[PDB]
Amino acid sequence: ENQIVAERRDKLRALRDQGIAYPNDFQPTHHAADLQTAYADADKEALEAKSLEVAIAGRMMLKRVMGKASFATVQDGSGQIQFFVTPADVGAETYDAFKKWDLGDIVAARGVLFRTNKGELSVKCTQLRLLAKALRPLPDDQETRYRQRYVDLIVTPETRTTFRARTKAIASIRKFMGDADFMEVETPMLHPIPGGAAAKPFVTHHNALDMEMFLRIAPELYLKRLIVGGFERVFEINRNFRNEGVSPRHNPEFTMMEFYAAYTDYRWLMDFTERLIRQAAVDALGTATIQYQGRELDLAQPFHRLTITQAIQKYAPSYTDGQLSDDAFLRSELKRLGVDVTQPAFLNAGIGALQLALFEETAEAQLWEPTFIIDYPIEVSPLARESDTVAGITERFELFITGREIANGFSELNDPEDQAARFKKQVEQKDAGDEEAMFFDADYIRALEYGMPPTGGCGIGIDRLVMLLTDSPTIRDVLLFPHLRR
Amino acid sequence: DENQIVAERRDKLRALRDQGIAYPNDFQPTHHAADLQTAYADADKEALEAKSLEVAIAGRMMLKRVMGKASFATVQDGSGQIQFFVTPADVGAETYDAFKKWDLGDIVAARGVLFRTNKGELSVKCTQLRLLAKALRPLPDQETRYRQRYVDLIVTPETRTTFRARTKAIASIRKFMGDADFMEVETPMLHPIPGGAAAKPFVTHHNALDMEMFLRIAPELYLKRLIVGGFERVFEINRNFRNEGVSPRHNPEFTMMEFYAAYTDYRWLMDFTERLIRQAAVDALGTATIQYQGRELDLAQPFHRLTITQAIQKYAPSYTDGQLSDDAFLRSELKRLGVDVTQPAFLNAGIGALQLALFEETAEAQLWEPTFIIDYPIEVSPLARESDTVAGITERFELFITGREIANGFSELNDPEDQAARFKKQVEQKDAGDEEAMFFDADYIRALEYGMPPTGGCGIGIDRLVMLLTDSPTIRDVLLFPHLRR
């Protein structure tokens, strides 16, 4: 390993004594992938007539030297093609230098396209150059993929494909939002008071002003300020930050899309979110009837819509109606399953919150088929409009697919006095030790007091959506550079 | 006094809650003011009475004209303004009486027939009229625009126009990049080692991992890892963070676009950046011959391309060639202009850096017409490829328009040994007190040691570009929520 690097470093030393070691004048004219497509059906004779001159640059992935003739496989950004090399065509000095290059080196050739006797498409090199020496060899392990994504990208074509699909899916989501009349906006990543979500923040400090500032846990409160300001339809796709546990399923920064539509409510949001996701599949995979991790996932069907208790009953039928309505039962049953209900997060827990907690331990992970869970207790929905007909319930949903939260939304709380009250109740929890409880945001209350129209809002987890569209088993597989441990 | 008004409005809200749902969310508008104004600009009183078009509108009540038998309100939705004509005959006495006590600012809604008033205005003959949300604070100095952008957005149509244009411009830039085959990517905003720029970082901490992290000053080093990985054309549009003073011309977070193209160099980058900017103007304004702050700005002309000393001579013709190549002259001349060259940023200053510093104090702010400044000293260009023909010079540019930096780019340093050396020289400066000097990044060097193809990279200041395109005088005028200033 070190001896290999040293040997390659010594070649680089010699290379510098005889010219420009890292030249930047070569201009490729074609892409391997495009040649493989456009000339799949052409044969030795067809190609000899066309006599197409090409110029390719990329990473040398294989090399075979056999006396007066040598073959290499070169990989550019698009794919692979062979270089065929003889001193007759490339000249003796280049041929000799070529033989001493290494797997990994960035190389470049001009030459005529042709087909080898074994059937492969290849370049009869008439010019051949080394553009950049690979000092470290390519490997020929489970975490290296993430610590050295650049290696994973060279060596695993599937990885390149996943990330091209991420990019296309996000463009497709933008198009969908734009067609539905939403204005894409940029709100701050630095907040003087974090909010818009239940999460532990990252804190930093502005030196000139001697001021604590928080990386955003969510843009929600800023996006609703825009609604007050009179933009009826806004959305934002960007990072949130959450300072919590690390795992294969957790990264400290992740991409959310939030959107807000004045004069809508949660029923509208659910229909709209459902349509968006289904179209996201059709765009990415040609169909909404797909598979994820070896199991059928039919996004073409209408999404299920269930209450919290409906969902517990569907997947944990042993629970009776009377049991799910009994405070004392719910507490002992939650204690049994490892939920400490004495924790400050539960300071304002009523019967609804206990049910929700039971749903999380029993049913949630089993929501394979797309399922909206509907009507959430007020005590855990501090930003959500209260029902007009049932006290203590909010017009809120969460969407689960494959057992993971993909979206969450609600009729927005536009009543400033209600909002102030619910903030004070969060501060109680926070004072009692609940680190995911919200801070009182006076500037936000002030904004609402200018008068905010009734509005519907939703956040979609772009990283999790992309997992489904690319059959990626963890969030780390859809992030170019996941954060890792030391 | 603003207080008595709030209190009075708060008391109306109290009465409102005793008689129904204060913040209803069931009203569904069917039309937009702007669309009605366009579609029926050409129609008259009789036309409209025949058509008899039933509409439903919701928005903010901006003016109210009251007479004995009737009332007119000017209501503003997301699209524009339309009049509501209100009589108790048609809306009912009880509603008419309530209406008289509603306030400028309230969010209101009507159904009714479209018609034209004798004074020529398009209006709704209301048959239903509702209050959707009480404005508790009344609608209405130079900094309030920024602390309360939501107020500025309601009251100033120019502000709305600027931000719609920002959004459109960014979509136009994404399209330009996509058409040129660049793949949009997302790299981390939390870096374990900050780099890619000369700036003071914001520092934070991940608690679960007990790990110091930095908010990114630039994504550059992560984008070049993707080039090692084999993506040929990548770009990213997102926030950087710099922990320094807030001014009218500075915000601690701002939007950059960086792009990288394998097998290109700085000449290519300059042509590409020039085309991008000119097309951005055509897209936004219909022409590249535009105006900024009352002065002609002709982006249609080819951009000037000057060396650092050429530019000093163009604006200060006193300076001779020998003066600008004399160390002792440059120092005394810099001392005269108030520049401290003893500062650690200048620890590795040679003649080039001194020239650059003189250019900053004499010519830079006068670069009104788009001007590329070209060929930068190595000691201030730690990430830029060195010239093949002139030692100590890098293939680097900065683009200035209206005296402000709009872009900066270079042929990328893909030589890992050169890069390691230049990093060690940065660490010297940093150890001697230069807080903008770079840290040594070993992981980045390791990536380059796998072999990176020659590449060209550039960063464009989106916020500053958008200023030019929208004729905004400061960066704060193109950010929805600028950071606090004192």
Ligand SMILES: N[C@@H](CCCC[NH3+])C(=O)O
């Ligand atoms: N802010 C929410 C998404 C939007 C909820 C509706 N206002 C989140 O972080 O999940």
Ligand SMILES: N[C@@H](CCCC[NH3+])C(=O)O
């Ligand atoms: N990282 C640079 C932009 C790209 C320079 C070329 N690699 C900046 O922050 O200005």
